[PDB]
Each structure stands twice: as C-alpha cells, then as structure tokens.
Amino acid sequence: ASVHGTTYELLRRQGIDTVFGNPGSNELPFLKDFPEDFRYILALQEACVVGIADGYAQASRKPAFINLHSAAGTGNAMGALSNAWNSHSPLIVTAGQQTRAMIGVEALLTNVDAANLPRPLVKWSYEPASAAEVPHAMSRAIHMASMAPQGPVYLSVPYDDWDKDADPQSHHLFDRHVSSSVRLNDQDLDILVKALNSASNPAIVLGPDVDAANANADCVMLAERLKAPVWVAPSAPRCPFPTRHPCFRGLMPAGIAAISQLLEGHDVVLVIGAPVFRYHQYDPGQYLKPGTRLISVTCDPLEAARAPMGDAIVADIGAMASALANLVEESSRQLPTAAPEPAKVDQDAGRLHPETVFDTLNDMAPENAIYLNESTSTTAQMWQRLNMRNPGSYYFCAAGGLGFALPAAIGVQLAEPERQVIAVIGDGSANYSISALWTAAQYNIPTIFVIMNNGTYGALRWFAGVLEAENVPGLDVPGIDFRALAKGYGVQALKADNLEQLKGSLQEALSAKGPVLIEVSTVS
Amino acid sequence: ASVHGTTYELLRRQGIDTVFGNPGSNELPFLKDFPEDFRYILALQEACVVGIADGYAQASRKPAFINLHSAAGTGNAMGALSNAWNSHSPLIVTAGQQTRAMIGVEALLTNVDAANLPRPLVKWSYEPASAAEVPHAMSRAIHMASMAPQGPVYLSVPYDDWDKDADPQSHHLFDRHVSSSVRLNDQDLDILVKALNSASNPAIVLGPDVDAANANADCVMLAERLKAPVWVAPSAPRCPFPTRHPCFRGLMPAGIAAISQLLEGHDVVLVIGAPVFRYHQYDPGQYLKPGTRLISVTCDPLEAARAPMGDAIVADIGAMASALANLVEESSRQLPTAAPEPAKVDQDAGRLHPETVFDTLNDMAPENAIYLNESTSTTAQMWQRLNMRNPGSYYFCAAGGLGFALPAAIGVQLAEPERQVIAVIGDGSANYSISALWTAAQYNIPTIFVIMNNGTYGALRWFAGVLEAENVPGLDVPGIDFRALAKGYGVQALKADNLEQLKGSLQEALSAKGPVLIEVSTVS
Amino acid sequence: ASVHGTTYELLRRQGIDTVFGNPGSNELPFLKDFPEDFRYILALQEACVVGIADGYAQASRKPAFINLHSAAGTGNAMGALSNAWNSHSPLIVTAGQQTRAMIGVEALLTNVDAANLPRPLVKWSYEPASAAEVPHAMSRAIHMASMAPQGPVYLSVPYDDWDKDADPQSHHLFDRHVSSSVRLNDQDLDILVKALNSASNPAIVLGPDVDAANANADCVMLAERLKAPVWVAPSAPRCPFPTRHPCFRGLMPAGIAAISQLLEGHDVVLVIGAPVFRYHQYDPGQYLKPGTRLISVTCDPLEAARAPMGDAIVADIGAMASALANLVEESSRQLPTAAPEPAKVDQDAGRLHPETVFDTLNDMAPENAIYLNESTSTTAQMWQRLNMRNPGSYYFCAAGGLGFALPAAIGVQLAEPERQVIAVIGDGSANYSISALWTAAQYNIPTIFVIMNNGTYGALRWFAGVLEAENVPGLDVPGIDFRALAKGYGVQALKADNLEQLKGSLQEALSAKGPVLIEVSTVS
Ligand SMILES: COP(=O)(O)[C@@](O)(c1ccccc1)c1sc(CCOP(=O)(O)OP(=O)(O)O)c(C)[n+]1Cc1cnc(C)nc1N
Ligand SMILES: COP(=O)(O)[C@@](O)(c1ccccc1)c1sc(CCOP(=O)(O)OP(=O)(O)O)c(C)[n+]1Cc1cnc(C)nc1N
Ligand SMILES: COP(=O)(O)[C@@](O)(c1ccccc1)c1sc(CCOP(=O)(O)OP(=O)(O)O)c(C)[n+]1Cc1cnc(C)nc1N
Ligand SMILES: [Ca+2]
Ligand SMILES: [Ca+2]
Ligand SMILES: [Ca+2]
C-alpha cells in the first residue's frame, strides 16, 4: 500500500470522512484520487476553512480534519486557531510541505521551521522524518486532538511522501481506541459528594466543556438535586444549561469583583467545565469573598494550574457530571425560582434596538434553533432574551477572535442539518471572514446570517467610554452594503430597516431552501 | 507581605521545605533571609543539582524544588532535564533573571528568551509579567509539575521582584488542592475487567510510573489473580515489581522484534505505566504477532498518542492499578513458576566479572537496599542478579543521559535515610557528574558508589561491534584514579582489584558512617 | 559517494580537520571509518567538549566542529553554548539522532523537537528532511557559524543517514567561499572619519570582536593617530589592546552611572566590537552625560538594535578597524600618558593575596603567555597587573557562565602550542568542568591551571554584602582537595601555601612537559 492509501484508511477507520480545505500544489498529491466515500468542503480563505471545520467539530462532538497550503495557508488560519485552542476544539490541521528534495534550498512554498509556525495555539505540532512515518504521525494527530483536553493539532507533510510505500506494520494503527473518559477515584469522589451534600447554600458555574461533553442534562439533574442556582462562566463559548430552567441565573460578568460579589453568601461553589475564570474587563477586587470556597472540575491541567483560588479536579466532564448527578442527595431546600422574563424595550417604527431583534428571534425561531453570536456589544441582552432549551444551541468566539461565527455557523449547520442555525453578527465582525458565505451558497448549507448594522465597532466605543479615552481612530465602519456582499457570494439577501421588515425578512428566511443573509439596521 | 514572604509561604503550604541549588547574583534576593524551616542543598554544578533533586523527588514521590542561576545555570542542567522529562519527575526549576530595569539592554546574566531555553524538556515554562504575579506563577509551576503526567517545569524570576509588595489576594493560592487521581469510568472499566477475566493467556508489562505511584503491591495482586507473567518495559527507569516473585519474567529487550516474539501466544497484553515501547536498538519486525492484542494504561497522553499498536486508557496509575487488582476474578489457571536463579560465572583471583559484582552485592546488601544503575553494558545482568523485593529499589537514567546516577543516588539517600543506597556506575559514566560527590561528603549523605572500572565505554564498543564499525575514535577512557577523585571531594575511597578485596571493601562501606566510593577493577 | 564520505570531504574542503566530541550510539555511523587526516579530541562531559572547542575556535579565529550525543549530550552543553553565543564563537555543533524509522515511536535516544533544544543560544538550528540533504545542511551550518556575527549553530542528524547515497550535485558545496568582510560605504565612512578628526577629546572603547578579528594592531594605530584613551568594554570576554600601551585605561566598570562618569568630557566616544554595554551590577544613572555622543561599530545587528544610546554601524570589525586606522588624521594633541604601575599589596609569609599572585605571574610568565580568568572576585586586579602585549592573550566566560575557563584553556593551548596558557580559576569555578583536566592529560596539552583557593564563592559574598543580604545559604565550598582531583585525572599537581611556594611551583610548572595544576591558598 501507499502512504496515501494507508492514511485515508486510517482516517476512515478513525471516523473521519470530511476534509475541510483550501487547496495548493503541496497538497495535490494528498488530494488526488480523493476517496469516493470522503467529502471535500472548499472555502475561499483559510480562516474560513478552519472556522467551518471548528463549528462542525464543536457541534458534532468529534474531530474535524483540515487541509491547508503550507505556511501561507496555515498563517491565514492562525486567528481561527486561537479560538479553537480556547474552545478545546478537536481539529486535525494538516498542511502540505515542499518535496523533501527541495526543502533545503527553501524553494517557494517551503514551510520553514514548520512545526513552530502554529505554536502556541496547538497541543502537538510535527513534521515526520520520513514518508513511511506519515500514517503513524497522522495517528498521533488524531489522538492528540481527541484526548482530553481536546484541542487543535498540526501535521506538516512533504508532498512527495504520499506516493511512497507504507510500512505494512501501519495496519496496527487503524483500530486503536484511546480513552480519556475518566473520573475521580471513589474515595475522593465520596469526599466531594459529601461536601456538596453538606453545603448550606451551594452554587454551580458551568463552562463550555459541559456542552462539548453533552453533560447538560446531567448538570440539570445535579442542580435540581442540590437546589442550586446555575451560572454560565464568563466569556462563554457555548451554552451548557437550559436558559429558562428555574435554576438558571445567566451569564456571569467577566470581572473579578463582579463574580466574587455574585458568589457572596454561597458556601460552596462548584465550577464544571470552565476556566476559573475567563475574566475580560479590568475589575479588581477579591477573587472570592470570605465564606465562599470553590471547587473546580476541569478537563484541562492548564486550567487547574492557573486558577487563582479553589481546589481542582482534572477529569472528563461527561464522566464527572454523570457521577455527581447520580451520587448527590436530593436536598430538602426549595428549588430556585425562575428568573423573570426580560422587559420589552420601547421600539419605534425606525432602526432596531438589539433587544427587539433578540425578542423577535426568540418569537419566530424554532425551539431547536442554534445561535451563534459575534455581535460583541449585545451579548448580555442575547443571553437574557433567547430561550435555549437544548444542548449545542450557542457558539461564541472562545478567544474573542472575530471572524469565527460566520464560517462556524456554516459548519454547525452542516453538523446539524435538522436544526436551523441563526448567526447574529455585527457589521464589523461580518467582514473578517466574509468569503465564508460562498461555501454556504455552493453546498446549499441553509444557515441564516443576521447582520446587526450600526455602522461602528460598538464594543470598542463602550470600552473607550469607560477608559475615558478621547481621539481614538478607526472605530467606525460606514459604507458596507451587506446585501451586495451576499449577492457577490451567491447568498439570498434581505434588508430590515424596521420591525415590520424584520418580521417579514425572518419569515422569508425561515421558509427558504438555502442560506439567507438579513441586513438589520440597528440603533447606534 | 513581600513577594519573597508570600512565595515561601506558598511553598511551605504546598509541602516544599528543601531547595536544591547552585547560587548566583540573580538568586541572592530570593535566597536572602532564607527561612529557618527550609533546607538548602548545595551542589557544585547544575547537572548535579538537578540530578540530586530528581533522585529525591522520585524516591519521595513528591515535587522537588530547584534554584539555578540564569541561562548558564539552566543550560548546565539541560541534560539532567532530559532524564527528568522521561521519568515524569515532578521538578520545579526556578532560575534567577536580571533586574527588570536591565533586561532590555541585555546586561550580563540576562536570560534571553528565558521561557524558550529549557524547551522541549519541560511541561510548562514561564517568566511573569510583573513582581506581584510571581506567587501565582509559582503556584502554576507547583501544580503543573505535580499533575499527571508529572514532569519538570521552569520559572524565571527577575531578581528585583522578591522585595516588591505581594498582592493580598495571593493568600487564595496557599491551600489549593489539585487532583488528577482519576480512573476509567465504571462502564468502560467493567469492559476492561471482563476482557482481562476472559483472556486465556494474559501477560502484564509494567513501567516506571507504577513504581512512581507506589502501585507495585496492587500490580502483584493483579498478576496473582490473573496468574499472569510480568515483564518490565524496556529501558526501565525504575523497578515496578518484586524481582523474585514467581510471576516476574525480567526486563524486556529494547527491540521491536524481540518484544513481539516474547509476547507471541499471549492473547491480551496489559501494559501499565510505560510507554509502548521505549525501544533502543534497531530490531525491525512486527509490533505484535497475530493473536496478541495490547491494552495500555498510561498517565501520559503523549504516550497513548504515539503507541504504534493497541488500545490505551489515560488515567492515574495508582487509581487504575488499585481498581483492576480489586475487580478482576481469581483465575483458576496455575500461578507462573519462578525464574530459576542465575548461573555463577567462573571467576578467577583477578579482575571482576560484572556478574560477580552483582552476585556479591546481592549477598551482602540489606534486603531494603536501593540500587542505581549507570553501568550501561551490564544492565541485563544487574536485573537478573539483584533481588529487589520492595518498591523504590532501582533507578536508571530515563532518557539514557549519563550523569544521572551519581547525583541521583545522593538525592535518593536523602529521601530514604534508612535504606542503604548503592550506585553502580561505569568508569565512563562516573565523570559526567563527578562533582556531586562533594554534596554527599558535605551533608554526610551515606551513599555507596561502586565504580565499575574497565577503562572503556563498553556499551559503545558493543554497539560498534554489531554495526561492524571500524576505526571509531574516543571509545577508551584510561588513566582515571577514582580513589583520588573521591579524596578530592572528601569521600572515603576503597579499591577492589579482586573478589577478596571486593568483599572486604563492601563490608567496610556497609559499616561506614558516611559516603564511600569503591573502585572495582572489572574485566575488559 | 555516501553521505558520510561527502560530508567529510565538505568539512576538509572548508578547513575543518578536528572533531571535539563525546561519543554515543547515534554518532557511531558518523564516527566510523574516521578519516585519517582528521583528529578526534575526546572530553568526558559535554560542557567540557564545547568549552575546549570554544577556546580552540576563539584562539584559532576559525570554526570548530563538535559532535555530541542526542538530547542529553546537547543538554549537558547548553551552559557552554550560552558563553559561546555571547563571544560570537563560530561553533558547529552536531548531534546524533535516532534512526529515522524509530523517531516516531520516540525510542530511547530520540532527540524530540531537536531543532528547538539549543534555542535561543544558536544562530541556526536544523534537522534535515532526508539523508541526501545532510551535506547541504552541513554547508549551511558551516557558513551560518562563520558569517558575521559569528556564533554557534546546531545540526541534528539521524544515524541512518550517513550510509545513504549522497546527491552527486553536492560537489558544488565543497569550495563555496562566503564573505561578510564588509565596511561602511565611502560617503558615510568619510563622514565618520571627519567626525573623528574634528573631535576635541575623543575616547575609544574596544570589545571582544576586536580581538576575534585580530584588529588589535589597527586599533593601536587608530588610538595613536587620534591621541585617544582606550578602554575595554565591560564584562570583557577578550583583551583587544596592549595593556601597557600609553593610551590604555583598563577595563570599564560594568555599571551605567560608572561608565557615563568615565566618559564625561569626551565629546565623541567610538565603540568598536562591543555591545553597548554589557553592564552587570545595578548602577542606575545617565547612559551618557551631556556633551558626549557615542558611535558604535558592531558586527552584530542585535547589538546595534539594543544599544540605548548612540549611532551604530553594522560591519566587519577587521575591515572597519583597518579602514579607520588608515584614514584618520594624525592629531596634533599630546599622546595620552601611560597608567602608572599598580601598587604592591603588603604580603606576609602566609596565604596569598590575589594581587600577589597576579604580580608573580606577570614576573614569571613569558611575554607571549595567554591567560584565562574564572576567578570572579579578582578580575579588576587581574586586568591591572598582567602586561598583555599581544592579541589573543585573555579569555573570560562571555555570558558569565562558570565552567568555561578550565576546558577553554585546553582548547586555547591546542590552538597555540607555542604560547604558554595559564588559567586562573577560583576554587568554586574549578568544579563546574573539572573533568576537562583529563583531556589535557590524555593529549598532553601543557596548560597550567592556577586554582585560587579561598574556600568560598567570593564574588557572591561581595554582591550579598552590597545588597545587605543576610542569611544566604550555599556560599561556602570547603573541603576540596584540588591536588587529588588533578591526580584523579592524571595531571601533575602542586600546592602553594605562601609566596615562596608559589614561586617554586610556577618555576616547576613553566619547566614541565605536560599540564600542571597549582592549588594556591588565597586570602579569604
Ligand atoms: C500551482 O499552484 P500553487 O503552487 O499551489 C500556489 O501556491 C501558487 C503561488 C505563487 C505562484 C503560482 C502558484 C497557489 S495558485 C492558486 C490558484 C489561484 O487562482 P486564481 O483564480 O487567483 O489564478 P489562476 O491560477 O486561475 O490564474 C492557489 C489556490 N494556490 C495555493 C494557495 C492556497 N492558499 C493561500 C493563502 N496561498 C496559496 N498560494
Ligand atoms: C550504546 O551506548 P549509547 O546508546 O550511546 C548510551 O547512550 C547508552 C544510554 C543508556 C543505556 C545504554 C547505552 C551511552 S553508554 C556509554 C558508555 C558509558 O561507559 P561506562 O564506563 O559508564 O559503562 P560501560 O558501557 O563500560 O558498562 C556512552 C558514552 N553513551 C552515550 C552518551 C554520551 N553522553 C551522555 C550525556 N549520555 C550518553 N548516553
Ligand atoms: C556575583 O556573582 P554572580 O554575578 O552570580 C556570577 O554569575 C559571576 C559571573 C561572571 C563575573 C563575576 C560573577 C558567579 S561568581 C560565583 C563564585 C565563583 O566562585 P570562585 O571560587 O570561582 O571565585 P571567587 O568569586 O571566590 O573569586 C558564582 C557561583 N556565580 C553564579 C554562577 C553559578 N553557576 C554557573 C554555571 N555560572 C555562574 N556565573
Ligand atoms: Ca457594529
Ligand atoms: Ca566502562
Ligand atoms: Ca573562591
């Protein structure tokens, strides 16, 4: 067998059947004789390739496979890799290298010092020392991406390797099963359970690894048994809990003082599947107030190490959430009362308040819709106004890197063909990965894109306001016609200048057979 | 509080009470006002500092704390760090940096690009962005070293940081408990146990992480229940099993073909706490023969990823070995028969055969002796001839880096004051870290050093023989007087030119109140 | 031809005929059939290998070639590489890698992420993608080490590469001539010369790259023409000027304030072949005082970039010093007056003052002696008391990394067989690379080693004194018998407890036919 044949066999035996890519000459020997059981998803720029693959992996809860062109293709994807690192996305990033005979002279398209290029944004990064090693290196990449804590990995392959003879002993790679589905030992788990049972006023904080593990239902059971309020950890990349469940208390503000104040009076705070904590704004104060102790369950040693407070347990989130939910006592305390419905913001017949947009989406979207958020100034309102009952219903750029939601919404929609994906994206954010629209059109992936157009980088205006910063350049983005951009890439386009038009546009979009972009005129 | 006071409080609260070091000016502000409850162990070169700390950590089964001088001190220790990486040794390596005001100009003793210096031999490597961050960074270092898979970490600290005010919120660091004591979920553990119960001819292979976890006794129970032969994985850094137990089958040869042949006919091979596998020599063949399947339990994702065959489970070795030992059925198969005693090699009244030396050590040493091996050509014979009943009885340079055993034997002896340490070290190997002898003399750490003097790099002569390599330079090391070297560093010195003298020297050494070096004239 | 044959041909055609090494199995296929026209110099530990090669390269003013064993051998040498980086030493460091077929599994002796290991201490670091690339990669290593600014480089070679067929087109590598012998363009050089001619009170500061370039005599001419005082830049790795020439003003103190004070009143300060500046102690103040402007000629862009003051020209030191010396006007100002002779320190019949030792060395050593300094507390006195008339007469660890002078003195003596090398090394410093003594004995390289024994890390006691630091551990090194250490490694050993014995010992050492170590009892 060839390295080509052996590698594709390894991929299929490990459950991989799709290649997300933007092709180049170093990759042609890999892509030739493309197997008939595989699918190739083209995107026009590598931030888009990786964003699509990322959405697909996060929603499918399985690794996604990417093929990029040498250093320039890899480089174009590095902002996207920053998000993937923070979301623990299992991405296998491969990049084609020059033929081994031309690496020394640094021919055009040589990826120099290749394994160093994507660092520090990957778990593992490698170029094999010989062609016959390629299948083994691919095996390493698959498992490194897939083991807890999941994350992106990088493999560089000289293009002449594919046609070489594979090692017959590579067959041992095909069916390897590698598990990190582990939980705390019985003795120490019993200690933890007793601490939860004994708490007088417990609180629960959940992060994105809960949703990645599909541990949501177990966390609901856990919260119900403990009669505990549930918050989502700050800067949330995913939604780990039904947002209208009586225990739900919403998204935590991303500040040190804000969080310790919120947790004041809670004697035991159990954090599951989150860093402690993904703060954002400067908000100095106490990490925790006197009387509060924190216990973190995390899949990631790097998270456990850097928490400034609390105890930690490094284990699989699925296994731990299931064990805790099934072991804790039913508390005799009263179940928390549901948060009241949000207020309706006054809305005239002109430009849309973001609150109006979210209320209308909530009214009209199916109960199993999936939302993506890259409308950076409206996140708090979005979290309050969308009833998200089901797992896998929310995605937000985990490293704050713009250019995620537009392509990721396409990957999510590909992963979940029966759940309507609705990406709510600011006019600024929409540009970073605008060319991803083409992939939705070409493959008829029926994502709905809602562009919140207020003509400015709104979140930056706000942060500048709090800093009291005068004379900041580059904050306005006037003069972008999003309907024309959509037309450019073959996506049906609608405009909503007021509420009547918003409802009409959403009705049309929800009824459409392909992707649709709606440009919404929102208040400055 | 100062950063100095806060950092020492964090260290003591996390169980650290000893600093292994070689001092410099960048470290003086850390070492001043050295706490009265701490101990400082000086060594004369940094390979020795780290080797001593490494032996101490491995034997104590807890992190060891190291303080080195900037780039040159760190650099001198990098061979030692290569071993520590392979043995999963929890080492907290700190190095002093220039004052922040002088880093930019690259004053003498500036550690340039400091965090990159020890890579790729550390789990985590960092320089804090401010003085107040130092305690938090130290906390990260402690936990990164200590979490499975354990390993060395690196922290660079500008010398002006120590006198600065600490953040009062650093108190939250002091008592953090971080656990990675995890095992496979119940459902999948039951599947594994059933596979072991159902095996017709199981075999067990154990690596160094078994001994690190003190999982030895649990592995004995497991082997007895399964009635299974037990091998030690190749290139063994530690001894994970009583070497005269009936199930014991010895050290595996470090070759692909050799190992698959050894495992032929075994239907299920369970590997615990080892890489799969630390091969050494070129010995191409089948990874496993038809009819053998392999299951690996490893604490290290990097090991699970790179295994060329078998299934893997990434979990704590202590927790997994205990669970398996207590869950498996008692097989009705006959218990394996003990290996017969080794043959006595013919020995005249002249120079000593290594076999004679090991037989004599076995005869005379206490039953709870601890051995170290850096006699590279005699390893197979050592493993056959020393009855090692207890855990923590054997150490060998885990990355093959010479200069480990001499200093490590001092650290081990410090960790285990009631167990006689005997380091068996070749004449070539003895030189790499010769100055470590001084630390044994100064602190009166009563390690026995047995120098196997055959005048040559024996293992290299052998590898050259198999390669059929003629005219290789640099293989001989004549003209070293090890008694004079011992005298140089204040260690009592004896010479054994024959068996009568060997017995006499060992009797004197075992009766001595301090460290002793015995130079043994061994056969070429 | 084989890769082996082609690589040795490239080496010899590029002027390399010596391999400094400590061998291992990954290197045996390189070292086998060792060419009869090459020499191999064995040392017992890799810090010693690299130190010897470094002294050899610095004294010979040509690249030195090193062969180390994988990661552990490379790691043991990294402190030595820190010095080599700072001295711009042209060192070609090669290390053997596992066979390509065993790299993936990370067999014992695999150098993982090899090219990253020696960073940031090398100019270039690489592992070739194929065997046939090895000669080209070696060519790159030779030229990268040799081009200004010279420095160490690293090449990792899988051991199976050597026996493979070379590319016949590799012959084009053999005779490549690569020059960086460049100087400032005529127009701008004329501007510089006019600025020097017009200066009313110029000063000259010289660094190690002057001595490396053998630009010393040209700098003498330059200083004589400009009638300018000449200082050596601080933390001096080499001596760039005759120390009894009337213009000579000695070693600059390594402090910001000290240097600006020294330069006060000098209108133009010309720095040649030094960083601006290698400060050491904290000594805050003005970089330059009003009225002083600085112009730096440096071979190293990294030096030019980081200078906090002055203009800079990046060019070859030899070419620039020659051009300036031959272009400047003869000033009509009076030639500076020679510094007066140092005072004789009162000396009783007991332990030796360092000043006495240096005076006696100056009295007895030949006029073409070469000194090395690793007696860290006595440097200022050494510089004042040794008349060094000739180039290449002084070496001091350029990064402050101890363990340099003992091995480097052996390499220097090998490079300069007709110039008596005398290494003056503190009792603390002597231990770092003590095993290097063996190489001097084995090859009968007649270096004289003068051990300044005061029982303590003297420089650290002084820095602790100025910091007012109490209770610092690890500052004393009692109980080392240096005569016994010398005997251990086969070097003739003498002791000097007083002046009478010092003179007697030096007379014997200077008359000896081999290496000699003198242990001198110096004042605490
Ligand atoms: C033979 O094509 P290659 O050697 O692969 C290619 O790299 C290249 C680069 C420079 C000169 C000629 C070809 C080019 S050329 C190429 C096609 C560009 O199509 P375009 O329609 O612009 O022009 P044309 O080829 O039809 O005239 C692609 C996608 N690539 C790979 C590639 C992918 N993603 C990124 C960021 N950079 C890249 N270079
Ligand atoms: C066949 O020998 P190798 O595979 O090359 C070797 O690496 C090794 C390592 C572990 C087990 C067996 C051999 C060893 S063994 C070896 C000889 C040691 O001589 P010694 O006199 O100590 O014992 P013996 O061989 O005579 O019994 C050397 C120099 N090397 C290479 C080496 C050089 N410098 C440093 C820092 N570490 C190293 N390992
Ligand atoms: C004030 O001392 P420092 O600034 O710390 C020091 O780095 C130094 C370097 C160059 C010139 C002056 C001092 C030196 S000087 C010093 C003492 C050496 O003692 P030695 O007995 O050799 O001479 P002396 O000081 O008594 O005359 C030490 C241990 N250090 C730190 C150090 C530790 N380990 C290694 C590999 N390299 C180092 N430089
Ligand atoms: Ca906007
Ligand atoms: Ca030997
Ligand atoms: Ca001293």
End-to-end CA span of chain A = 62 Å
Just name the CATH architecture of the largest domain in chain A. Answer: 3-Layer(aba) Sandwich
Q: Tell me the β content of chain A.
A: 15-25%
How much helix, percentage-wise, in residues of chain A? 25-40%
CATH superfamily of the largest domain in chain A: Thiamin diphosphate (ThDP)-binding fold, Pyr/PP domains
The biggest beta sheet of chain A reads: 6 strands, parallel
Q: How large is the radius of gyration of chain A?
A: 24 Å
Question: With helices defined by DSSP (H or I, 4 residues minimum), what is the helix count of chain A?
Answer: 20
Can you tell me the CATH topology of the largest domain in chain A?
Rossmann fold
EC number (chains A, B, C): 4.1.1.7
Enzyme class (chains A, B, C): lyase
Binding site for Mg(2+) (chains A, B, C): 116-117, 119
Subunit structure (chains A, B, C): Homotetramer.
